[PDB]
């Protein structure tokens, strides 16, 4: 068992979602995911194609680890 997965870690992850305005309250992985990413949007995920795939790549993969955590629920 990680600890990268338990209830602190998971509590941590979850309060800093909150904290960022991006998690919420019946919220799918995708929903989260999106949210995330345009958080992350800015300068350079606008003149750089690579940088916005890097941001959706990244926010996808948050978004996974929420789920993982019991934050938001599997897309259907
Ligand atoms: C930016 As949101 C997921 O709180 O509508
Ligand atoms: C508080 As809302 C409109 O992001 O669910
Ligand atoms: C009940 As809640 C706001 O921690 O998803
Ligand atoms: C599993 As919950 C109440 O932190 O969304
Ligand atoms: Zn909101
Ligand atoms: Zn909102
Ligand atoms: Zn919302
Ligand atoms: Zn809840
Ligand atoms: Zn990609
Ligand atoms: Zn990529
Ligand atoms: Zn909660």
């Not at 992850?13 to 019946?26: I, P, T």
């Not at 919220?27 to 690579?50: C, D, V």
């Amino acid at each position: 068992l990680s600890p990268q997965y338990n209830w602190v870690a998971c509590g941590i992850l979850e309060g800093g979602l909150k904290a960022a305005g991006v998690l919420e309250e019946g919220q799918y992985n995708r929903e989260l995911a999106e949210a995330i990413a345009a958080k992350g949007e800015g300068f350079w995920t606008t003149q750089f194609p690579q940088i916005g795939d890097w941001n959706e790549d990244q926010a996808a993969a948050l978004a996974d680890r929420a789920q993982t955590c019991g934050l938001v629920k599997a897309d259907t």
